[PDB]
Every structure is written in C-alpha cells, then in structure tokens.
C-alpha cells in the first residue's frame, strides 16, 4: 500500500505533465498491487474521462465509492463525467451528494456552480462560485468562471480590480505552464495582452496534442499535386455547427456554390443531424457529407479525413462547444486553416492559417496570431441573409418615416398594386401606403394582438406571431410565404424618437461602453437605446448603472430574444446600431446591416473588436467607423440629430447591402477559392505556410 501510494503519486504527476498513457499504466499497476485503493480507482476514472472512456470511468468511480462510501472527490468527479454524457440529473445528484458529505469541499461547489450556469441559472451559479471562493480563496478556475458569470449579467461591482486580478491569475498560470482558467474564447473580454491571449490559446491547443499522443500515430503522408483528385482541390469543412447554429446561418450556401470543376467539397460534421433545413442543405449540396459524430475515436476519424484526400482542412470551431481540434492536431491534411466560427487565433502550431482580412487583422498585429494571415479581399465575414431573408430585400411603409410601420414580403408588390392609392418615395424606392381604411385595419390587427388578417385575398401577418403561422419561417429554415407587418409599437418603442439598438448578448457590453451609450442618449433628448433580455437578469444591472450615469429608466427599452427571422426583421425599426467595441456584433452585425440599419463601431486591436469595422469597410460606409470614443459618440449623435444625414446614411446602407460584396455569397465563395489556390500553390511549390496579404 505504500508501493501502491508511490505508483499513484507518480501517476498523478505524470497526469499533470500531460503524459496520459503513462499515468493510466501506473494507476492500473497501483490497483494491481492494492485492489481496495479508492483514490486510484477515482484517479484512473478521472483520466479515462479525459480520454473519452466515459463508461469505464463511471465503473471505477463507483468502485471508489463502494470501497469508501464517503469519498466526496469521487462523487464530484463522477458528476463531471455524467455531465459530459449529458446526464444533468445524474451530475446534480453527484455534486450535491459530494457537498452533503463535505460542505467545505470547494471543487464540488465550483462544479455545481458550472452546471447552474450551463442551465442558465446565473444567480445560483454566482452564489455557488462565491461559496467555492469563500472556502478556497486561491481558486483560479472558480474566480475566472465567476468573472464570466458577472460579465454575462453585466455586474461590474469592483470591475477594474476584477480585471486586474484575472490578468494576474493568468500571468501566474502561464509562468507555471498550467492550463489557464480564462477560456480562450472569453479572453478578448479582458485587458490581457495579445501575448497572453495567444498563449492562453496555445495552452488549449497543447491539451489536444497531449490527448492524441496516446494513439501513437505516425505523420500522415500528404498529396503534393492534384493528380489523384482529377485536378481538383479537396477541401474539408469541419464543424459541429451544421444545423441550426449561427455558423450555418453565415455559410450554408458556400459548399454548394463551390466550383466543382476545380474544387471538391467535403463536410465533416462533428454533431449529429438536428433535423433542420440547415443540415439538410449542407448535406445535399456538399459533394461529400461525412458525419464524424458517429466516429468517436479521433484516430479513426482523422484516418477518414486522410483517406478522403483533403488538401485544405478547415477549422470552423476553434475553441467552441463541439470542437474536435484533436482532429487537426493529428494533421490529416497538409494545409489546415481557421475560418469564420472562431473569432481568435488557435495559438496552435497545427493550424497553418487564419482566414481573415486587412481590416480585421492588420499586419501590425500579426503577432496576435500563431497562424499566418490569409487575407480575403474585402471582409472574411459572410452571411446567408440574401438567401434566408429575401423578403427583407424590399419594404413598404404606412403613414413619412422608413421605420415605424413596416411591411415585407415576397408578394408585397402584388399587394401594393391591389391598393388604390400607393405612393413611391425616392430614397436619399420605397412604397408608401396612405392613411386609409386598409392602413387602419393593419394597425388594428397589431393593437389587438391578432395573428393575421386578409386584405384583397393577401395574407397579412403580425410579425409577433411568426411561430404560430409557420415555425420554420421563424427559424430561417423557410422563406415566409405571407406578408409581415412589423412596427415600433409591437416592441414598446416610441413613434416619435430616435431608436439606437444593440441586439448582442449583454456580455459584450462593459462600463466604458455603457458610458458612451449614456453620453449619446443624453446628447439626443427623446431617443432610446433598444437592448435584449440576453439574458433577462442583466437588465436591472444595465438600468441601474445607467441611472447612476444620469439617464431616466424610459431611455432604455428591453425586448425579449426572438426567433431568428423576427430578430432580423425587427432591426428595421431602429434608426442606428451602436456596436459594442469590446467585442463587436459579428453574426449580429450582419443581421442589423441586412435590415438597412447603419452601425457605428469603434475597431479595437483584437480580431473580435474589428469585425464590424471590416463589415462596414466592405459595405463601403467608412463614415461609420470611429478612431476613438469621441468620434463614436459624435457620429452617433450626428446620426440622431442631423436627420437628412440619417436619411442619406440609411439609403446608402439599404442599397449597399445588395450592390456591395458583403452579402454576396457567390462572390465570396469565388474569392475564397482564389485564396485556397494561393495556399495550395505555395505548398505544392514545396514552401511552408507564409502570409498571404494579396
């Protein structure tokens, strides 16, 4: 049993180091010498859990507990395993049982907090992280995770001190080569240096390298020419987000727009089929669709990618939920590039390129990234809005304002032509329906909360009732087949004032940003800021910090999160979008621009803080991009007071969303194609990854 104990401690150190195979070997040998050894069962279970052997893991956790019924550790680690298997009920039973055994067990409190957060119970998560910290004040994981909860609800009590402490915690962890407690995806939210952000990522990349080294795969041998593929570049899009996810809402038309003479497209799904048209469309239009969710072993899954012959393997997850970067760590393809889904560097040497653009990622900051920059010529951002919401390409109003009462629809022109007295208005072409028996009936439907009515045989629908009329149109899976009415009164917005919006999750907002917004609102009397309950419990924090800034309550109007098509349709009711500088609207930025709504942004240094400025540059609206906070406020105030200048900027957005590259998925695909071929030349000529700043 001291022989056993030294095997176990060695195993623990081998584990901290990342030598997983060897750790396992030793735990087993520990049990081989001392079978009734609870901690070895639990630690073995715990490393098997790292390896994805969830069942075998559970079996050893239960041995541990059988041997020692009060072993709180085993219960807490078993909870994480159950959580990994999506058995939330089982995880909660384990965590609470561990806390019942030892109410001072801080890890157990921290893990209970984490499942509360994931369930969208932030107040309880915060409370349980606080208990963790109370019990163990030096607890990085729990602190940083608390910091993210607070961020999420816009709690900024002791904000600057908190930021300083996150940085310090990360500094320390990076000095000790331990896994930082700030997740790489969250790292743009805090005043970490680009070196810290790059290193955070590098460390999570290293996790993946450690996990694949147990498999002992030799390097794969990679194609040097297009001979086996009949002259076609084989491109593999790897994503867990081929389904109802923002990623598919951005890029679902790209696969089938690829040029099959010169490209052969393979989609590697990491998630199972969710039943949505998004999945249906990519499965139908990619040349080959492979479901790697059915292939849990990453060895065998990388094998497949290699035997499909991929030249460029594309990482659409980075560090997001569903990632299997282990696939990329095995390098089954000679060229591996980050694209679209992850707004950061991977920090990993197994990724060769990040696809991006000059505005998003200027040369100055190329040391922000482990990868070489592969520049698209306009923005790297793209959106499938032209295909998903073509009923928003045109609009009509009722009585002259462009954004109080709005009608959209595929058959809108025909309905207009059915009416006696429609006027057309030249934009600085917008149909206008005069105040009329018909106009009265439409407004009446809205006020009374009616779902739809009929006028001249046309179906006219209440934009608030999309899920009752057609739930697939609500999600963006189908184009609506009725005419939709959308109005400021449906959202409690005033008919007579400037509406600034921002429809992002509240976490992207920070004190400086809300201070800007307040300044702007103060400068523009009778205007409002229109935000979302995302989540709803951030609302009072926001409202309060705004009261402290001088603003009355009625100046900020919260609406609920809506189905995808309503969200997009409703941005039409706003005058201006005030983008979040800390982390811009990305998908959200394309959403609001498709409504014809100008966006004021202030590009920062991070990739996430520059994306909207790149969208806007591609859109051709340089006037909306601020160089500092005074600019940002002046632009926004100007757009709220100089109303002719507001007409002009809105007309420019409205038409540039069609005539500019921004929402042009075909053009984007073709440009993407040129860039892939550049990447391929360079490597086929025997060179290594290098910058492609066209």
């Amino acid at each position: 049993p001291t022989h056993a104990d030294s095997l176990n401690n060695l195993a623990n150190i081998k584990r901290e180091q990342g030598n997983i195979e060897e750790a396992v070997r030793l735990y087993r040998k520990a049990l081989e010498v001392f079978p009734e050894f609870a901690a070895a069962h639990s630690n073995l279970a715990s490393v098997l859990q790292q390896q994805g052997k969830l069942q075998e893991a559970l079996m050893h956790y239960k041995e541990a507990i059988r041997i020692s019924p009060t072993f709180a550790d085993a219960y807490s680690n078993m909870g994480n395993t159950l959580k990994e298997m999506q058995d939330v009920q089982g995880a909660l039973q384990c965590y609470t049982r561990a806390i019942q055994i030892n109410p001072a067990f801080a890890d157990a409190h921290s893990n209970l907090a984490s499942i509360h957060k994931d369930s969208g119970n932030i107040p309880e998560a915060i409370a349980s992280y606080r208990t963790a910290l109370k019990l163990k004040p030096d607890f990085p994981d729990a602190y940083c995770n608390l910091a993210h909860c607070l961020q999420i609800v816009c709690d900024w009590t002791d904000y600057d001190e908190r930021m300083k402490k996150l940085v310090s915690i990360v500094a320390d962890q990076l000095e000790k080569n331990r896994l930082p407690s700030v997740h790489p995806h969250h790292s743009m939210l805090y005043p970490l240096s680009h070196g810290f952000r790059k290193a955070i990522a590098e460390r999570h990349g290293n996790l993946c390298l450690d996990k694949i080294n147990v498999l002992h795969k030799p390097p794969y041998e990679h194609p040097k020419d297009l001979k086996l593929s009949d002259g076609r570049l084989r491109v593999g899009y790897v994503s867990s987000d081929f389904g109802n996810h923002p990623t598919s809402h951005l890029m679902q038309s790209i696969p089938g727009m690829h040029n099959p003479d010169k490209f052969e497209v393979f989609c590697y799904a990491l998630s199972p089929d969710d039943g949505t048209n998004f999945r249906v469309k990519v499965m139908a239009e990619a040349n080959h669709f492979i479901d790697l969710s059915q292939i849990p072993c990453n060895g065998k899954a990388a094998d497949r990618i290699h035997q499909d012959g991929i030249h460029i393997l594309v990482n659409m997850n980075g560090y997001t939920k569903g990632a299997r970067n282990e696939l990329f760590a095995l390098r089954p393809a000679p060229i591996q590039a980050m694209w679209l889904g992850y707004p950061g560097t991977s920090g990993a040497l197994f990724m060769d390129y990040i696809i991006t653009d000059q505005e998003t990622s200027p040369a100055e900051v190329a040391e922000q990234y482990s990868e070489k920059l592969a520049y698209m010529p306009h923005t790297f951002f793209i959106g499938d809005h032209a295909n998903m919401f073509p009923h928003l390409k045109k609009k009509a109003v009722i009585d002259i304002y462009d954004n109080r009462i709005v009608l959209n629809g595929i058959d809108l022109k025909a309905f207009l032509d059915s009416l006696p007295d429609v006027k057309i208005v030249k934009m600085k072409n917008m149909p206008v329906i005069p105040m009329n028996t018909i106009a009265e009936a439409v407004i009446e439907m809205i006020n009374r909360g009616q779902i739809q009515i009929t006028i001249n045989g046309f179906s006219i629908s209440n934009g608030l009732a999309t899920t009752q009329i057609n739930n697939k149109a609500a999600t963006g899976e189908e184009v609506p087949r009725t005419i939709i009415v959308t109005t400021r009164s449906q959202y409690g917005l005033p008919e007579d004032a400037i509406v600034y919006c921002n429809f992002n999750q509240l976490y992207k907002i920070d004190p400086s940003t809300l201070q800007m917004w307040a300044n702007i609102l103060k400068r523009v009397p009778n205007s409002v800021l229109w935000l979302l309950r995302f989540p709803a419990v951030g609302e009072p924090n926001i409202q309060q910090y705004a009261q402290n800034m001088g603003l009355p309550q009625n100046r900020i109007i919260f609406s609920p999160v809506a189905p995808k098509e309503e969200h997009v349709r409703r941005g039409q009711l706003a005058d201006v979008c005030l983008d979040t500088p800390l982390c811009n609207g990305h998908t959200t930025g394309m959403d609001v621009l498709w409504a014809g709504t100008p966006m004021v942004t202030m590009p920062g240094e991070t990739l996430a803080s520059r994306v909207a400025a790149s969208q806007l540059t591609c859109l051709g609206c340089l006037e909306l991009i601020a160089k500092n906070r005074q600019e940002y406020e002046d632009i926004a105030v100007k757009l709220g007071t100089d109303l002719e200048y507001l007409k002009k900027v809105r007309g420019k957005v409205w038409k540039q969303r069609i005539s500019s590259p921004l929402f042009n998925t075909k053009q984007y695909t073709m440009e993407l194609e040129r860039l892939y071929l550049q990447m391929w030349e360079h490597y086929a000529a025997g060179n290594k990854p290098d910058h492609m700043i066209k």
């Binding site: 997740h183 790489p184 995806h185 923002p246 560090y319 969200h567």
Partner: peptide
C-alpha cells in the same frame, strides 16, 4: 430558444 457561439 436561440443558439449562439459558446465555450
């Protein structure tokens, strides 16, 4: 309800 980018 509505799907987003997450870690």
């Amino acid at each position: 309800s509505s799907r987003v980018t997450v870690s």
